[PDB]
Ligand SMILES: Nc1ncnc2c1ncn2[C@@H]1O[C@H](COP(=O)(O)O[C@H]2[C@@H](O)[C@H](n3cnc4c(N)ncnc43)O[C@@H]2C[C@@H](N)CC[C@H](N)C(=O)O)[C@@H](O)[C@H]1O
Ligand SMILES: Nc1ncnc2c1ncn2[C@@H]1O[C@H](COP(=O)(O)O[C@H]2[C@@H](O)[C@H](n3cnc4c(N)ncnc43)O[C@@H]2C[C@@H](N)CC[C@H](N)C(=O)O)[C@@H](O)[C@H]1O
């Protein structure tokens with residue numbers, strides 16, 4: 608029910624120019640639907656299912672590098688390696704990286720960040 | 733130098749509370765947290781504040797997830813040394829509140845994580 | 856090799872800025888951060904980008920919290936080794952910007968945290 612493990616965080620753009628969504632709820636459904644498909648497909652391959660909590664956001668960077676004024680519409684995906692389901696943390700990590708790259712490809716993103724953070728998970732069921 | 737932060741993820745249980753918007757879910761969960769944190773504070777003098785964020789959680793539809801994700805909330809907070817004198821008792825308190833939130837939101841499962849953090853508090 | 860991420864939590868000060876939606880607050884804080892980060896970059900060549908999320912912060916009404924929570928914003932960012940040559944200088948830049956944000960948002964207190972993180976950057 609408790610133990611040291613890893614969480615991940617990925618930040619992606621929503622690519623309005625390609626998908627033409629017009630609200631943050633539409634953007635969340637877009638990214639969430641892609642994550643759902645790729646996570647299920649990898650689960651069928653490796654028996655490792657990576658669930659993700661997805662949050663709306665704006666990412667602020669220099670307008671001279673392409674950022675809209677007041678920020679780019681983005682989505683933050685996070686998840687934790689639950690030892691109830693993950694027997695091998697290194698395989699899970701490699702799965703997350705694989706999914707992050709697939710998300711970057713299918714979202715047509717030029718760059719993407721994927722972070723791993725040490726966490727102590729308490730799981731109540 | 734280092735302290736802890738927590739992160740809890742819960743469903744919002746629209747079917748039970750009959751809320752109709754993510755804004756209503758935030759007020760619902762906020763009010764529940766506000767009440768349970770106050771109640772615990774009056775027992776132990778340990779107040780656990782929480783930053784609450786809207787979210788969706790994506791998992792396998794075979795396990796009950798709606799297409800594109802379940803509506804969820806993320807609650808986070810930090811053990812501020814200004815207010816916290818015993819980190820172990822603070823962790824116990826977060827866990828106690830996380831279990832109360834799980835019960836009141838009628839959740840079958842719930843995650844509560846602790847992450848090491850370096851807090852700079854400006855006042 | 857780990858790097859750092861930061862997390863800042865701030866009020867949105869609806870009463871001072873006369874905003875009436877979370878979207879308006881997000882754009883306002885986003886513009887304020889964009890300006891202070893650009894000005895700092897023009898001096899030090901350290902650009903601190905930030906991912907900003909809407910939120911509500913729940914604390915004791917006895918200390919001034921509104922019922923169900925205060926409207927807040929969470930700003931996070933990562934020290935990407937592709938652009939950050941000196942982590943200490945980056946950390947001091949984040950702290951400097953957090954203090955500027957506190958002043959410009961007219962906040963009485965503000966938290967700024969640093970968390971160790973393993974960053975994979977795909978380009
Ligand atoms: N900090 C920096 N210092 C110096 N130059 C920079 C910096 N950032 C960007 N640049 C320039 O811009 C070019 C593109 O860089 P990049 O796409 O990485 O620049 C990114 C970061 O500045 C920021 N960002 C991304 N993930 C973040 C996270 N987890 N936390 C905080 N901020 C985040 O967001 C920027 C744009 C991304 N959101 C991607 C935008 C778009 N969807 C795309 O795919 O191209 C670089 O090659 C540089 O020339
Ligand atoms: N990763 C997995 N691998 C294998 N089987 C799984 C997995 N996840 C769920 N299952 C199956 O589904 C059953 C239910 O498991 P569980 O309720 O824990 O499955 C949860 C996780 O997959 C995901 N989730 C929850 N917290 C998360 C976090 N912090 N980060 C990332 N994802 C998070 O969300 C799922 C459902 C929860 N949101 C709760 C749903 C609902 N409100 C409820 O109370 O039952 C399990 O007994 C398994 O049979």
Ligand SMILES: Nc1ncnc2c1ncn2[C@@H]1O[C@H](COP(=O)(O)O[C@H]2[C@@H](O)[C@H](n3cnc4c(N)ncnc43)O[C@@H]2C[C@@H](N)CC[C@H](N)C(=O)O)[C@@H](O)[C@H]1O
Pocket residue numbers: 779780781782783808809810815864865866867912913914915918925927961962963964965966
């Ligand atoms: N935990 C506590 N225990 C005991 N006394 C407390 C506590 N918190 C606040 N107080 C009392 O209230 C006064 C003000 O304290 P403070 O402004 O720090 O109290 C803050 C925290 O309780 C909470 N908060 C802020 N950042 C947070 C984070 N990252 N995670 C979780 N919660 C967060 O939010 C409270 C108010 C802030 N959002 C600022 C509100 C307002 N915008 C302002 O600028 O004054 C203190 O001097 C004490 O008298």
